[PDB]
């Protein structure tokens, strides 16, 4: 080995060119001369390969003993270039040579192979041990999110992962000792034993170690399954127009179950809240919802965490409510008090205005950090008491800063230097550098009591301790999903659940024919309008007979849940009026009937004067594209009378044979404003097109100019 | 500063907004209707709808190309043995004798008891192959001093008019046959319901295309280019006779080796990717070239005999033509199967959308219909000026053919035309959507389209079809201008 290398160096240094390269080239400049290439670069690799595979000896052979184990020819087939053809080019081989090696070549050692390629072999066992549910055909609203492509053994920063691989494969060349070696000692040791005794090139080992330590995150279209174990099957999970239920093999993290738990509970409350007896429906759905393969009830009972939504569902299922909060490296459990969040634009001491959430009310919490166990007491934008137990410097350093960051004290916000959810960003800021935040706090006296003592910035006991340092549930649930104590004190409500719509890490299924009611805005919109189209004949017939029971058809309840709680009632008032007006004045428009019918479900809310609110567009939950146009077509709903095609969220359906002949020439102006009808053609004397405000501030009998859409002005009378 | 300069900048610097109307959309390339221009001639590498393959049962095996051609010619011995042919058509600069001699050399070589498919570099082969036609490279000094040596004026693609045959090709290639040519290998067995869904879909999608004329033409192109590229690398110095073949399968699953004719690969020292190798094609056809003579100016046609085809003696002609290709065209030919994916993806997307609406896989429903849903139909063409509807399968078979034609007739003219006419397509859509489109230089937009309309048979027919469809779109728009008035 060593002598062979030294003898080979001497042989190499005989060549005066090599002697020059080795002497003149710096260790840095190895990286440059390693890629040296004077050969003409191939511009068409796909063509060059199709060409080269028709030639005799297109492949390059590594000179050695193993190359020589390949014969010159086999049964007439020339395997490698002749000895009289070698020289100032090298020994080449045919593709047949590879075939010959895989047929009659040396049988090498494959011991450790499965342990080297563990990452790939787990990927296979996850598929092999997987279970497949139903495939279903319906709308899938996919969102483009940054997701992990492949599961990892233990995720690290690349620079950190690099050092760990060096300690495993090339310790002598690892360089300056790093603290990561001690942290990953149990990984290194384990990897050394696995990668002991294998003859595979260390570069391959390095790459395959990098695969299971260094993360690969990309933007991909997802739909309620974000965990890597799902992401690696993303191609089979869904398209835009179908869903495939997939349960991957192997075990899943509790943090993945917790995150999905919260998403599930938030979805159940958002659909339940709109029902008459939300608590009844919440219980019906919660019982039949599954997070991957585990029932929701099982996850809630098993995991000691979550949010408001989780506790509300716990109370509904008859489970003990946890009041657990996880603030990164801090774990709190509510002892007493109730806090409400109010997002206000507080000025921060670096030189920006960030929208941070102020928690009102006096609360007490059961804080914990490994060794440290304490009882906190915070008010609105302040810390008042903090009784903490004695523990290590490292365990106390976290808790004391975490307590003063989570309390959101006004001293912390006015002590930021440099360029930084906004609240969690402050946690990871003041954890790395703490000598900036303590200067922007102030110090006070230490208590000289029997159990009481104080500590300063040096992580030890001193008289200049930080300001405020002191170192030593049978609930009921209402129909409306409010958690009430025996004393009548409500400690949690539906209105306390987060509005944030996020993707579940694990695939959530609802074992109910009502599962479609749990869709996203675009999913629910598409299905709702499909239900209308499927029952249009009876729905339209019954409406023309004078009955209006269809207004409150069960099928529209789910739809209401994605209409903003404010406007739902006002939209219904307008919708019912416009509909009734169409049948009562014999000015029916089926496209408009279909469009507005679902908005008629909500209990109507009319103006103070008893007439309905007028509307230009009906805004639904989610992004700016999530709205219906009363007069116009919108991204969600558009009708073409030319071809009688109705486009809903890109899907095209024919209204052919569901349209009255006299309806095609009927202007939409009759079905656009409640208590208004088409008077005649545009009258320039009446002035500009009236706004909704001006149209609402019009006395009955007066005429006005309305614009339906570009190039359709109409004169309308009240 | 911006408002300062914007104030003093001339009103002559303007984006000239013009609100687009249907009336503004005049037909593209009006010269394609000019009867002074020659009708665009057939310029493809091989015959398509006019192909004739001599069928011979395969004994299961995939025997040598020379052997399978020999064995096929033995069964149609009369056509093989013809030494007294009638010259029907002659290409302006073609030597009929030299071509016929080269055909006889091919037949005699393919039919001989030797394994080699090499032709001797005879005076007729040398002429057909373009032996010693590259100009001699002299020294720059001599060339500079030589007054007669000039930089040649470039050849420009000639301006042609609509040819009836390009429609005929579209019509016949998109048509169903009794034969399947696709060579689709195996995949792993299905486990996931979605895998089972794809496999049940392929039974409709793949079988529709596989049976259509275009698929068989595609496979012929694919397999010929595959052998030709290998011959071009392996036998650079040798003139080689390469059979134009296909393995076709009938309804019962019986295999037949088709012989469409023989090709002569000339010398192929193909250094650069664009470097040309002369291929002289001798292809069988039932088509009389005199019926549509404007299609066939590139071809020298002999009448070599007759076959009894359907209670009738049908005449057999040999279409002879000096052609050429480079490495790139061969490699893209070898990849022409992907025509399947472009067509299949486009039509499966409609099935997936339709399934989204109904709640079950709408594949069978779209194709053949079911107890609930009527079969899905599409506007397919025109008959006596009236719009004709056809099936989902027909629509699939149209897109697939169109995608094959993109390969068969693909070049800078089609690249430029497709790219520039796409703007007009999207503007038309804006008028169809009533999204009030505005243009800044419409006549500049037409220039960029029309400069690409020259002698590409597909571009000229695409331009014709565009104008036809535009006319029907304009008629439809009259239903929309009445709405809400």
């Amino acid at each position: 080995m060593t002598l062979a290398k030294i003898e080979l160096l001497k042989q190499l240094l005989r060549d005066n060119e090599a002697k020059t390269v080795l002497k003149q080239t710096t260790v840095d400049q190895y990286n440059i001369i390693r890629k040296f290439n004077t050969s003409r670069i191939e511009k068409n690799p796909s063509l060059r390969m199709k060409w080269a595979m028709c030639s005799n000896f297109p492949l390059a052979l590594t000179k050695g003993d193993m190359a020589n184990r390949i014969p010159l020819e086999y049964k007439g087939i020339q395997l490698k270039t002749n000895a009289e053809d070698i020289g100032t080019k090298g020994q080449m081989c045919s593709i047949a040579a590879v075939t010959w090696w895989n047929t009659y070549g040396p049988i090498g050692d494959t011991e450790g192979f499965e342990r080297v390629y563990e990452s790939f072999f787990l990927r296979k066992m996850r598929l092999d041990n997987a279970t497949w549910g139903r495939i279903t055909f319906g709308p899938v609203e996919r969102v483009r999110k940054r997701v992990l492509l492949n599961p990892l053994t233990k995720e690290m920063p690349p620079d950190e992962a690099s050092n760990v691989i060096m300690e495993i494969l090339f310790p002598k060349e690892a360089g300056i000792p790093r603290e990561s070696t001690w942290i990953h000692r149990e990984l290194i040791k384990e990897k050394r034993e696995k990668l002991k005794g294998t003859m595979i090139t260390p570069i391959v080992l390095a790459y395959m170690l990098e695969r299971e330590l260094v993360a690969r995150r990309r933007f991909l279209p997802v739909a309620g399954a974000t965990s890597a174990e799902f992401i690696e099957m993303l191609h089979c999970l869904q398209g835009e127009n179908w869903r495939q239920i997939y349960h991957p093999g192997g075990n899943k993290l509790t943090e993945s179950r917790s995150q999905s738990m919260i998403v599930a509970c938030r979805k159940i409350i958002r659909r339940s809240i709109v029902a008459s007896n939300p608590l009844e429906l919440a219980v019906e759905i919660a019982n039949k919802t599954v997070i991957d393969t585990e029932p929701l009830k099982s996850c809630l009972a098993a995991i000691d965490g979550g949010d408001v939504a989780c506790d509300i569902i716990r109370a509904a299922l008859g489970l003990k409510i946890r009041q657990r909060q996880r603030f990164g490296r801090l774990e709190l459990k509510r002892i007493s008090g109730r806090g409400f969040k109010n997002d206000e634009e507080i000025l921060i001491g670096n030189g920006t205005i960030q929208k941070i959430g102020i928690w009102d009310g006096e609360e007490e919490f059961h804080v914990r950090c490994g060794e440290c166990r304490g009882i906190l007491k915070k008010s609105k934008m302040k810390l008042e008491k903090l009784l903490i137990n004695s523990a290590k410097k490292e365990d106390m350093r976290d808790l004391i800063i975490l307590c003063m960051v989570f309390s959101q004290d006004t001293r912390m916000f006015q002590g930021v230097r440099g360029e930084i959810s906004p609240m969690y960003q402050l946690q990871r800021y003041f954890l790395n550098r703490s000598n900036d935040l303590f200067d922007q706090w102030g110090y006070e006296e230490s208590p000289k009591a029997s159990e009481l003592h104080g500590i300063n910035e040096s992580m030890n006991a001193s008289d200049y301790t930080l300001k405020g340092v002191v170192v030593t549930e049978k609930v009921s649930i209402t129909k409306n999903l409010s958690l009430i104590k025996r004393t009548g004190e409500v400690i949690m409500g539906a209105n306390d659940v987060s509005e944030l719509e996020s993707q579940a890490q694990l695939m959530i299924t609802y074992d109910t024919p009502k599962m479609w009611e749990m869709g996203t805005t675009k999913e629910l919109v598409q299905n709702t309008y499909q239900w209308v189209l499927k029952n249009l004949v009876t729905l339209k017939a019954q409406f023309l007979l004078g009955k209006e029971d269809m207004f409150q058809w069960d099928a529209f309840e789910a739809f209401e849940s994605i209409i903003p709680q404010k406007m739902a009632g006002q939209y219904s008032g307008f919708a019912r009026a416009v509909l009734k007006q169409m049948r009562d004045q014999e000015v029916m428009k089926t496209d408009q009937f279909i469009k507005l019918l679902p908005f008629c479900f909500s209990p109507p809310k009319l103006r103070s004067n008893g007439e309905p609110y007028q509307f230009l567009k009906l805004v639904l939950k989610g992004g700016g594209e999530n709205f219906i146009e009363v007069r116009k077509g919108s991204p969600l709903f558009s009708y073409n009378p030319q071809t009688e095609v109705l486009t809903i969220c890109g899907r095209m359906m024919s209204l052919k044979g569901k349209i009255e002949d006299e309806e095609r020439n009927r202007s939409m102006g009759n079905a656009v404003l409640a208590g208004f009808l088409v008077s005649g053609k545009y009258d320039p004397d009446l002035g500009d097109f009236k706004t909704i405000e001006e149209l609402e501030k019009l006395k009955p009998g007066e005429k006005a100019n309305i614009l339906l859409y570009q190039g359709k002005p109409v004169k309308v009378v009240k | 500063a911006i408002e300062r300069n914007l104030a003093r900048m001339s009103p002559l610097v303007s984006v000239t907004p013009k609100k687009l109307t249907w009336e503004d959309l005049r037909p593209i390339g009006p010269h394609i209707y000019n009867h002074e221009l020659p009708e665009v001639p057939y310029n493809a590498f091989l015959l398509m709808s006019d192909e004739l393959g001599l069928a011979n049962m395969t004994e299961g095996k995939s025997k040598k190309p020379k052997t399978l051609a020999k064995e096929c010619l033995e069964k149609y011995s009369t056509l093989r043995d013809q030494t007294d042919p009638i010259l029907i058509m002659k290409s302006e600069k073609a030597n009929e004798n030299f071509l016929w001699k080269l055909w006889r050399d091919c037949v005699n070589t393919i039919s001989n008891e030797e394994m080699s498919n090499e032709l001797q570099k005879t005076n007729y082969a040398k002429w057909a192959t373009g032996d010693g036609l590259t100009y001699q490279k002299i020294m720059k000094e001599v060339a500079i001093d030589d007054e007669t040596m000039c930089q040649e004026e470039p050849k420009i693609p000639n301006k042609c008019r609509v040819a009836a045959w390009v429609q005929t090709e579209m019509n016949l290639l998109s048509t169903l046959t009794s034969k399947r040519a696709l060579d689709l290998p195996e995949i792993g067995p299905d486990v996931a319901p979605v895998e089972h869904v794809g496999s049940e879909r392929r039974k409709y999608f793949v079988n529709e295309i596989n049976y259509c004329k275009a698929s068989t033409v595609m496979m012929k192109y694919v397999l010929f280019h595959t052998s030709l590229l290998n011959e071009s690398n392996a036998s650079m110095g040798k003139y080689k006779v390469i059979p134009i073949t296909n393995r076709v399968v009938n309804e019962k699953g019986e295999s037949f080796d088709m012989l469409y004719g023989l090709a002569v690969k000339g010398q192929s020292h193909l250094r650069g990717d664009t470097d040309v190798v002369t291929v002289v094609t001798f292809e069988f056809s039932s088509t009389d070239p005199r019926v549509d003579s404007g299609k066939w100016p590139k071809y020298t046609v002999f009448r070599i005999g007759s076959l009894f085809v359907s209670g009738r003696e049908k005449s057999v002609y040999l279409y002879c033509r000096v052609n050429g290709t480079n490495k790139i065209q061969m490699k893209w030919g070898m990849e022409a199967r992907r025509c399947l994916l472009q067509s299949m993806q486009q039509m499966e997307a409609i099935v997936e959308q339709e399934s989204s609406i109904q709640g079950y896989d709408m594949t069978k429903a779209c194709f053949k219909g079911d107890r609930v849903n009527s079969p899905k139909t599409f506007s397919i063409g025109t008959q006596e000026g009236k719009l004709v509807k056809g099936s989902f399968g027909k629509a699939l078979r149209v897109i697939f053919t169109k995608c094959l034609m993109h390969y068969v007739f693909g070049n800078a003219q089609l690249e430029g035309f497709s790219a520039e006419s796409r703007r007009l397509l999207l503007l038309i859509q804006a008028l169809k959507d009533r999204k009030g489109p505005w243009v800044f230089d419409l006549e500049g937009m037409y220039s960029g389209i029309e400069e690409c309309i020259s002698n590409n048979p597909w571009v000229i027919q695409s331009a014709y079809w565009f104008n036809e469809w535009l006319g029907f779109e304009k008629e439809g728009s009259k239903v929309l201008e009445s709405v809400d008035e």
């Binding site: 239900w531 029952n535 099928a555 | 079950y360 849903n373």
Partner: peptide
Amino acid sequence: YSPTSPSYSPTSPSYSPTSPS
């Protein structure tokens, strides 16, 4: 059933008219 069979789509919400007799 089979995905291509119309009865593979689940029974959808259907509006049934109301009458007190």
